Amino acid sequence: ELQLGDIFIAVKTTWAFHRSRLDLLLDTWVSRIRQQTFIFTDSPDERLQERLGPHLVVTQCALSCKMAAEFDAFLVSGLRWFCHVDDDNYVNPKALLQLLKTFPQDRDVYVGKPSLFWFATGGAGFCINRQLALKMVPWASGSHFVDTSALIRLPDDCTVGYIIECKLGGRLQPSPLFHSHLETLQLLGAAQLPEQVTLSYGVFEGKLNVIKLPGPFSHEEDPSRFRSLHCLLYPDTPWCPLL
Ligand SMILES: O=c1ccn([C@@H]2O[C@H](COP(=O)(O)OP(=O)(O)O)[C@@H](O)[C@H]2O)c(=O)[nH]1
Ligand SMILES: [K+]
Ligand SMILES: [Mn+2]
């Protein structure tokens, strides 16, 4: 009974990455789940506002103010599930939906890839359902009637985890399906790739960490491998090459 319509996907970006990162996501995974996808940025953009309308949220800025903006928008949506990703993440919404279907519908869930209290690495993507997110509000909002002294010098992903685990007695559910680029991604190939919820690209430990796909785009045309991934997942896409 859970549908794609029940999911609110929030992407964090910034103006300086509109051309270099965001356009890549719009041609790719965001094109398959645009109704559920919200891009949070810090400056307007003609191309994006064209392709996105109210799905481009430009913020004019406990949690950072783009992250607060994502949570507030999610809560206003009324949707059951919040999933946050960065602008170097690829999301497979069909894999996402199947993971989310796996949770009891009346329990608080926080799911993602653990990191060190436990927390879900922001760069791998993570999801929270509405009933948990509503319990987080007093801390997430920086309210004067909770202790947020521990929270002020934590990054957003650790803050989310701290609120959930240390303030609300909750637990991160780990999933191996979420991936950041703080991870040797080259250990995921065309066999594992369609089952993953998120993939990533980026430099880590002096290396450009990317998924292992031979094509169909060259590394020079598609250094992230996201276009190639996208073509693997949706071979009907007319701009896909052969190899
Ligand atoms: O000034 C900035 C720099 C980065 N980002 C966002 O923060 C996330 C991580 O950025 P990046 O991948 O460059 O940082 P890193 O992975 O090195 O931590 C991405 O969603 C970016 O869009 C941002 O909102 N403002
Ligand atoms: K914080
Ligand atoms: Mn990154």
Encoding tokens for residue 50? 């064209």
Q: How was this structure determined?
A: X-ray
Q: Is 86 a catalytic residue?
A: no
**Domain range for 82:** 1-243
Q: How many domains does the chain have?
A: 1
- CA–CA separation, 126 and 110 (whole Å): 7
CATH of the domain at 150: 3.90.550.50
Ligand 1: residue of 88, 198, 224 to mutate (most ligand atoms within 8 A of CB) is: 88
Ligand 1 contacts CB of residue 222 (under 6 A): no
- CA–CA separation, 39 and 30 (whole Å): 10
